[PDB]
Structure 1
Amino acid sequence: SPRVVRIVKSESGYGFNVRGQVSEGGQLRSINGELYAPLQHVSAVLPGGAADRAGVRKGDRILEVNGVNVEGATHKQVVDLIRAGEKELILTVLSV
């Protein structure tokens, strides 16, 4: 079940990669018996850095950015939301 985690931006960012769909909407899908519109997932986690230290794992799905639910959101829409924050990032991530 999803966990809420805080990543503190270092000089070189949050140290993880997001990958997902380019266009809005998409098929409803179930993770751990729970239904969602398509989510972006963490495609890479920089070892020993920021996101890693925060507990984010590769293949984690991103459910919320800073408390904003982002299911069904496009890739551009999500990465924008992350980069909005000055100092830090609060992620609601979901493992599989």
Structure 2
Amino acid sequence: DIPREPRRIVIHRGSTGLGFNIIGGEDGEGIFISFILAGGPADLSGELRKGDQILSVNGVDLRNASHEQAAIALKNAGQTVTIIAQYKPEEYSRFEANSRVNSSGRIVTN
């Protein structure tokens, strides 16, 4: 089973972006990670995953933030980005077309 408890993740932008994409941000629905680039800084941390909700970046609350102000935050976070993430597959799947959550907590797209 995948821990559902919140976690703190420090990513290092360094050369390129943060290596991941987000969705949501409409009506305080939240901001979720929908894709992680292989070899990117997010992947390199090996702590994040698709389905994770960004609760905050460098302390700035982002739960009820919008995709645009979340993008702005992440982009301003700097070289050393600290992220508070929480696995929410069910809440994430309603965002991805033809996606669902199997009985192991994993997100599946038929």
Residue 79 of structure 1 deviates from its aligned partner by: 0.8
**Using the alignment, how far apart are the partners of 1:85 and 1:48 within structure 2?**
20
C-alpha deviations, 1:65-91, integer Å up to 9, x for none? 111111211111111011112312111
Cross-structure match for 1:68: 60
Per the alignment, in what secondary structure is the counterpart of residue 44 of structure 2? helix
| Unpaired stretches in structure 2, ≥5 consecutive residues | 89-110
Task: Tell me which amino acid in the other structure corresponds to 1:20.
Answer: G
| Corresponding position: 1:5 with 2:3 | no
Kindly, what percent of the aligned residue pairs are identical?
33
Task: Tell me which amino acid in the other structure corresponds to 1:21.
Answer: G
| Unpaired stretches in structure 1, ≥5 consecutive residues | 27-36
C-alpha deviations, 1:53-74, integer Å up to 9, x for none? 2111011111111111112111
Count the aligned residue pairs: 83
Higher helix share: 2
Q: Given the two structures, how large is their TM-score scaled by the length of structure 1?
A: 0.77
Aligned counterpart in structure 2 of residue 89 of structure 1, from 81, 91, 109: 81
Cross-structure match for 1:17: 21
Q: Runs of 4+ in structure 1 displaced over 4 angstroms?
A: none
Q: Pairwise mapping of residues 24-63 of structure 1 onto structure 2 (< 5 A)?
A: 26=27, 37-54=28-45, 55-63=47-55
RMSD value over aligned CA atoms? 1.4
Where relative contact order (Cα < 8 A, 6+ residues apart) is larger, the structure is: 1
